[PDB]
Design a protein around this ligand. Structure first.
Ligand SMILES: [Ca+2]
Ligand SMILES: [Zn+2]
Ligand SMILES: [Zn+2]
Ligand SMILES: [Zn+2]
Ligand SMILES: [Zn+2]
Lengths: 62, 61
């Protein structure tokens, strides 16, 4: 945001699972499109933890 | 590796692989590759990375 170091941190952090922050995001929720979680953190949710839209598919991403 | 060059690298990685202008905004189903912005996704019927036939172009939130 406010500096190149903060901008760098944001782009590094945005790759990581929003729940555990320990593993890259590896799932996109259909239909809402949120890139939220690694594969393990996506196992327990049936609604998106950001927008609460019912998940119809947990699509693997790379 | 300077902060500025690391940042440039991560910013470039987010760019659509077709136009290299807008950021990636689509996930291809079923292969799951992040390749294109919304506009460029209209031009492809197969994933440019793995050539799998695309069944759905899911918008990233
Ligand atoms: Ca941790
Ligand atoms: Zn996780
Ligand atoms: Zn969502
Ligand atoms: Zn594009
Ligand atoms: Zn692909």
């Amino acid at each position: 945001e406010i500096s190149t170091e903060e901008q760098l941190r944001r782009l590094q952090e945005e790759k990581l699972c929003k729940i555990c922050m320990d593993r890259n995001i590896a799932i996109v929720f259909v239909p809402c499109g949120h890139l939220v979680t690694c594969k393990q953190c996506a196992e327990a949710v049936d609604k998106c933890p950001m927008c609460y839209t019912v998940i119809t598919f947990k699509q693997k991403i790379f």
